[PDB]
From a paper:
Here we show asymmetric reconstructions of herpes simplex virus 2 (HSV-2) B- (containing scaffold proteins inside, putative capsid assembly intermediate), C- (DNA-filled capsid, derived from the enveloped virion by using detergent treatment to remove viral membrane proteins and outer tegument proteins) and virion-capsids (enveloped intact virion) at 8.1, 9.0 and 10.2 Å respectively. The asymmetric reconstructions reveal a unique portal vertex in the context of the icosahedral capsid, including 1 portal, 11 pentons, 3 types of hexons (P, peripentonal; E, edge; C, center) with the hexameric rings formed by VP26s, 320 triplexes (Ta-Tf) and 12 pentagram-shaped capsid vertex specific component (CVSC) densities (composed of a UL17 monomer, a UL25 dimer and a UL36 dimer, presence in C- and virion-capsids). Radially colored representations of the three reconstructions reveal the dodecameric portal situated beneath one of the pentameric vertices; but, the density surrounding the portal displays a five-fold symmetrical assembly, highlighting the symmetry-mismatch structural features. The portal vertex of the capsid is a hub for protein-protein interactions that are important for capsid assembly and genome packaging.
When five-fold symmetry was imposed, the resolution of local reconstructions for the portal vertex in B-, C- and virion-capsids was improved to 4.05, 4.50 and 5.36 Å, respectively, albeit that the portal was five-fold averaged. The resulting density maps clearly reveal the polypeptide backbone, many bulky side chains, and atomic models of the portal vertex associated P-hexon (PVP-Hex), Ta and PVAT (not in B-capsid) from three capsids were built. Despite distinct organizations of the CVSC at the portal and penton vertices, the packaged dsDNA is visible in the C- and virion-capsids. In contrast to B-capsid, small tail-like density, previously named Portal Vertex Associated Tegument (PVAT), extends outwards from the portal vertex in the C- and virion-capsids, suggesting a possible role in genome retention and release. A comparison of asymmetric reconstructions of the portal vertex of the three capsids reveals notable differences in the position and morphology of the portal and PVAT. In contrast, five 10-nm-long coiled coils in the virion-capsid exhibit altered configurations to the counterparts in B-capsid to recruit the PVAT layers (UL25 C-domain), ensuring the retention of DNA. Interestingly a novel network of subunit contacts is observed between the portal and PV-Ta and varies each other in three capsids. Lying on the portal head, a novel five-fold symmetrical assembly comprising five copies of a well-resolved two-helix coiled coil (presumably being the fragment from the portal or pUL36) shows close contacts with PV-Ta.
Author numbering:
A (entry chain S): 106 to 168, 176 to 215, 220 to 279, 286 to 353, 416 to 441, 445 to 466
B (entry chain O): 5 to 165, 168 to 252, 258 to 318
C (entry chain K): 5 to 166, 174 to 230, 235 to 262, 267 to 318
D (entry chain I): 443 to 589
E (entry chain F): 1130 to 1178
F (entry chain I): 1032 to 1325
G (entry chain E): 1228 to 1276
H (entry chain k): 1 to 45, 54 to 199, 230 to 266, 355 to 562, 569 to 611, 618 to 627, 633 to 696
The structure:
Amino acid sequence: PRYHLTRQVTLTDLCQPNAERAGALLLALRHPTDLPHLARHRAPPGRQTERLAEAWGQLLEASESGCARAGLVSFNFLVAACAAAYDARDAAEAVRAHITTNYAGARLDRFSECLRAMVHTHVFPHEVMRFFGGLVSWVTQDELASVTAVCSGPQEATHTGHPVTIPACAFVDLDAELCLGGPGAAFLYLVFTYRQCRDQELCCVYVVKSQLPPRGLEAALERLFGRLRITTCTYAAFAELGVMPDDSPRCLHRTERVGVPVVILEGVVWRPGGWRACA
Amino acid sequence: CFEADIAIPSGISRPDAAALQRCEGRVVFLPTIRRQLALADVAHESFVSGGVSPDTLGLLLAYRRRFPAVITRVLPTRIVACPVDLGLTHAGTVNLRNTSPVDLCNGDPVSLVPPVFEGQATDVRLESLDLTLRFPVPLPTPLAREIVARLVARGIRDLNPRTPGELPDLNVLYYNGARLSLVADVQQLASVNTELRSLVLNMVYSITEGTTLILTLIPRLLALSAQDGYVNALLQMQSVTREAAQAPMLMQDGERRLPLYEALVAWLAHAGQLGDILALAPAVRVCTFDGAAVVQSGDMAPVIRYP
Amino acid sequence: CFEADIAIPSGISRPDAAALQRCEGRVVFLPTIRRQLALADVAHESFVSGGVSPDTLGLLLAYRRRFPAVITRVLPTRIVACPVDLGLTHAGTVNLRNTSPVDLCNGDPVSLVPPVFEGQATDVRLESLDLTLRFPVPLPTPLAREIVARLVARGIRDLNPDPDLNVLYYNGARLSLVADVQQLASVNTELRSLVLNMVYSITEGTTLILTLIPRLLALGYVNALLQMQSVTREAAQLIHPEAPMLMRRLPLYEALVAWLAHAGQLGDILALAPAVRVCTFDGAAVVQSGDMAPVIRYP
Amino acid sequence: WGKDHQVLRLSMENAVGTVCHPSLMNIDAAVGGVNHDPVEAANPYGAYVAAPAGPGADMQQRFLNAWRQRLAHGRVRWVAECQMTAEQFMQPDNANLALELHPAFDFFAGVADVELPGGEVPPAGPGAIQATWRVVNGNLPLALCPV
Amino acid sequence: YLGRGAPPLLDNAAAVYLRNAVVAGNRLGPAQPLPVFGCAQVPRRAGMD
Amino acid sequence: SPVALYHQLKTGLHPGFGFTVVRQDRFVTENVLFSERASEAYFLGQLQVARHETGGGVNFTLTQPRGNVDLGVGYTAVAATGTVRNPVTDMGNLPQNFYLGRGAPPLLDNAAAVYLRNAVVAGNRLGPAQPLPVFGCAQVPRRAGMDHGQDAVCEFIATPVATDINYFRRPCNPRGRAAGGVYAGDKEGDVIALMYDHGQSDPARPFAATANPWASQRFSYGDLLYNGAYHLNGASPVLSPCFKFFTAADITAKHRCLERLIVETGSAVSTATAASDVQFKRPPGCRELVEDPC
Amino acid sequence: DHGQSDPARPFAATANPWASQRFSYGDLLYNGAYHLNGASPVLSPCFKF
Amino acid sequence: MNAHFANEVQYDLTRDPSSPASLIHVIISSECLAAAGVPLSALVRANFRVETQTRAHATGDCTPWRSAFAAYVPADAVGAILAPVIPAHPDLLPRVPSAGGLFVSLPVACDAQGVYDPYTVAALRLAWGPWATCARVLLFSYDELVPPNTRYAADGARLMRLCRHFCRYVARLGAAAPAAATEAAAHLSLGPPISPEEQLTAPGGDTATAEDVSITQENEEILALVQRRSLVEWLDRGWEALAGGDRPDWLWSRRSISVVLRHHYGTKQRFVVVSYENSVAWGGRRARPPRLSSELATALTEACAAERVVRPHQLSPAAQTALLRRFPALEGPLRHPRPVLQPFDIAAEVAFVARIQIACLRALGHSIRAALQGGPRIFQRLRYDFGPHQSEWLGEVTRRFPVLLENLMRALEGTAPDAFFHTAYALAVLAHLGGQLVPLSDDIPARFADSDAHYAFDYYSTSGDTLRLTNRPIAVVIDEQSKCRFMEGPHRVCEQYLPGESYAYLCLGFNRRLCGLVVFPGGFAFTINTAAYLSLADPVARAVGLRFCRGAA
């Protein structure tokens, strides 16, 4: 009812929202203790399915689940772990200087191996680490966590807009699509662009910028790419991060919390959307 | 609603102000999200591209990259439109006008189709503001998916001639009775070609490795034909399935991948999505509060969200 | 919200009254949205479409057709349900009853057929007025799309016989799909019509495309770009399938619409779109079978 | 003077960003827009190239007799050696005023359609108005560059 | 042929010969024929007296 | 060649001809408005707004309708102009860059033009870095400091050297011939006739026809650069001073009834912007309310 | 449209093929789109039909 | 690059066709186009359509026009395959420049167990636009096109220079190379510019080398008695780090490349014969064993070279039929009474054309005499009124008249026949020989085939020199009297007027009926029955039309 609260109790083995900002684009970790099984399934047999059986098992080594399940993944944890992967180096790598000095690359180094191992056996990182929200409160303990980081529509950026102002956490991120500029409202999405066996199972996390519908986004997902050179398949999944109902309030900064480039985005209808991955 | 207005820009033909009154509940394709916008991008002259007007398959592609909007209230100064793509958050269920020869149902998903009918052109003309208006025809979605397959395949017959001139017209439609004839006047090629390619390229990926085992059971299909009712009615007479009847190819690597289960996945990925990648997305659903089971031609039906 | 009332009919027993006490928080389907309704619009006997009992196809036609309603508070002489499909997005928190998987903190659960699980579980019958309330199963979007394609794949090996498809691990648990002793023999006769639908839409199109594309490209931007992204994929499928199978334009393009007409049916039939969301507050983020969950309105 | 008690300087090295664009050689619409409403036969002595024919020994007595006719007909396009400056700027006495358009080019009444390295006597008749190219700066006429 | 529960003929040459021999013009005759999901679509004529 | 003319000027040598400079200073002034007693109407209305509740209340605006007519049949209540505060955009040396926008077929010798690409746009204050994408502006860079004011644009038009200096000792038309829609006599064809038809003489300087035939005639080098129909610039947001002079439609688009002519001079909309470091051509959403006698 | 039957008699398309069809001999004579008759005073009674 | 590759996707078609085929990559350079009559500026203005058809030498028909591909790139066209250009790294391989042109691979007619037929011509056509003026035709025989073997020996020096230039690029640039590129350099060191023209001019080619192993095994044996992952896999990461992608265009620049020089029998020119390793085209090392056989190029030569028979119609009667007992497709060029194509000549396709140039001029020249037998009465046919002193202009036209009709026919002789087929009379006959089919370049409007009143003109200069003043056939619809009317519709001067409207114009129109007009200024015109003088034999004309018609869709 244009104001909501959500809560999930996890560890600070992940994000450590005390080390994060007030505004962070948190993911969950849905199906957290999953993927020894789907490592074996869903892949053609030339992928040697005994890789992710150890790969996530080295992740929680860096992080026993207990009663506080592994979850609440930060926005930082994918950018810096793919910083060595995608086509931005020493600028996306400034996100690694943000994490390891505030959060830890010990958990990144196990997970950057997962980002070459999850995508290896066709266990693609979309529909795992589902969207949760914008880190409203951080009522966490010392080594444990209790975060309210509301999902559920536009109210996350009104109740942090009548007061976290939604950073993009990298100037390389918030992909400035539509340089063909005009007035309107912004429509935000979460795309994982892949490269399968060309760049050896590439991982990518960035947000697009468009005044485009979901039907005007799929052909926009076929155009503007140079990573078509694959053949397996089902690359470039995306869901709706929702509407920023203003293109006027975007910004360009390098000040956060290590000087990391960052984009202020004030006022967002967080339509949670749905994923799609077929081609 | 997240209110969006379109003003009356310049002058009025005095009966044509009443023509804007009887368009309450229709749909405007405005290619933006504005707090105010001129009426110039509204009409079909904006639908016309550089030099050339779209065909009824190009208008599908023209209605692709624009935004539908519902006429809510009609002022002599403005027209308040509600942005369907975002502002469908209406427990008041903002109302639409059915301009269609089909009496629908209760509970139909409703998708929008350009005017292609033989007698429901929806042509209203403004001469003070020199503009032409084609309103889309809201229709039920299986009947909508029965139309778009006809018009592309009619343009598939625009590539190759070969056959004698007596072709099956693709111009007789069937809803419980109700013989419908549509318009076949012009078929622009690029609207056919780009629609044909995605019909090709999606049907490429919808075949996989474990898909091939299913092809063995094609003679198994006709074994059910002469021994039941359901199968024999399922098997169409104008089908290639009755024509193709007149094998593992071992290559077995590993055999723990579930090859038959993986076949139905990627087939559904692309051949399962063939109505919506060719046509417009349905977001309008029939929902009347009074318990009325159908909605008459010309009525004001209440409209709820995405199906 | 806009709470809608379903009228309790005449004389029921106390176990029929207690049957109404074991359903507080289930999912109910209804044809129209009249503010007063009766129980005659609710029962499984109200799902007859051709004079016989519906199958899992005949339910999933209606399960995508009519409207979900969730009973908040049970009553004598009435049934209060605050329906899902009315109201603005992410408002009007409602409460569900879990069935054997988790329903995690997210997942966007989907109503679907009973006989994909135990058939005479959740087929709760009223004894006095003699009607049957077969409540749908609320499964979340990944596993709901998973199990729907497995039994119809298991229907193939049950169709014309000569691995085992039924293990299907969850994140933690091992989900026993097979309820062997009396259900699986009823499975392959209650998904009976449905397997023919997944087959005939494959046998038609693949045997149509292999006489479409050779009839195309020479009858040119779509020509060379046909196998451009399909190099050694479609020509390899032309090498594999067209050899170990058999090989007309005016019936062909007549069959073009008809298959793709059946294709547009199945997309509305299959894939089980999300209707309601779990995104709770101050919970343990993990729901168990038989426990309530705060469930919010729109995906 | 600037917006002070301050001096400023404008060179012709100032003119680097304007004269050096590749639009100085962009005269497509010019030849097209002047082409309609044609010009008559302007007895094209200097507006036509002949390919050579025979030895050079008699080549005069070819061209002496070949242009015996359309040489005493009228005048050539240049008469401006007699014209002082701003006599070109005035509306009389320069019918070729509407033919001076580009600093880097020339519009003059030449032959119509016969390809140039060929023939001796061009078919006097309708005329054409095309281009040549001004090569060096001295080709500007002497009412625009004083002696 | 409005219904479909009956197991049909096994020979296809008799199957869609006897099917369209009756259905061909009936006032109750299923045109654009029986979907797996959907309705039989009874032909509504233009005027009824 | 344009390549040779790049190569003559940096050395310094007069390349056969000359130029002319058209630029735009801007001056903030304190005007004086006399009025007659009873001139306007200015009525009043009613005050209430309960608008959309935005969180913790809408907070209750109350707007009021009004309206006003010119209650007077003549030129009531007019105007003056007396002081010069400060010259907002500077008297400046800043040249014009034509490589700012895409307008022309390049050289076919592509080795040559890419040499001349950065040769011109080495370090202009109006020279972009990371040059033109398909759609969008050139993004003129920002210098670290600005002192005197907004920057000028010194656009150049080729002139023969052999004109009078007597012309340009007058407020004259820089194209070399009178062009505005004042002088025409309402015969429906004389407007373009004084513009391009050089059979007649100049309305301004009638003993001759033009002053620069390279700037005057149709399809001349002056006319090829800054015509609004050709639109060489249009990607580059740098305001042409010469756009105002060289437009076949816009001077012809004006009326000539004198009553409406002078009052538009009291409030015209410029093509310039007093909210930008250079003369950025006017953004389509803003007003300026200039005077502009030119 | 003889694909649909007669509303008066649903068990038949028409009762006459020679006049009731489009471009049939009845419509050739008596429809006013051709006006084979009429520059003439005598009222055709069948003009209304 | 890819135009050689995408035509192989059209070679991935055919399946089981009428005749099994091959494909030869042929790189025409600049002066072979320039000396042909191809304006190099207009194709420089990369995928481009080429209409191709193939023609037998002896007898028979031709192929219809096949839409092919092209890549016209001004560069070192040999050096661009050998030293390609990464967008970030254009100095990955510095080279020596060369000439350049269009990249077009061309298919080859073969047999079952293919023995290719020399002297038989595949005909190119570049279409700048629609018009026949925007068209040229090129000639290529298989003697010109097919070498016996390639020269992949030149590919041996190239590939190890590639590994040294990956050893050269990282050492110069240093740490600016990314993490995948700093590895694959030194993995090529543990294993001068590249001039691409030396791969043509160094005398080395292919050899079976089995005779060159036994000639070396019995050569190193005496020496012995007296004494008594690869580098190519590191080339992929060499490209995948410097480019960032796969690029199947560059994938065959790493594999075996033979670059063979040949020459053109029409204009003394040179061109290039190319075969990769992975090409399904000819000379590829992934192809179908039944390819070509150089047997006809050795049979009819040596049976005429050992017998010293200079022309094989002077071949001995047993020496004729014994070759016919060997190769049976030669009954055409040896035992046909009057083949419409000349047997055993180089210009047999050219002499096929020049007859048509001759036979129409006699059909012209004896028809001009026909309507002008004696003193004529022509009075007029159009409506053009005079001023009073304008009649004295026609006082010249009395005196001027008879010198024209020689010089028209002199100019009809004076044109090349290759330049005659772009004019109106050479296509109006094709509009009539298709009526005894749509002729080429589609210069014929949609309404020329409607009436006989739709004529189609050419325009010649009356005064000065008698020269043609058109590119376009200007089709003017003509109604005692009849006034003129145009049809419906890069800028040519004379194309604005009515026929015979003004002085200094001769107007000359023709029909599908092939009853033509000769229109003079002043209405003074007359029909000519050239249909009474066109003597074109249909079996002669049926090889004419099929090479000059286009099957309209």
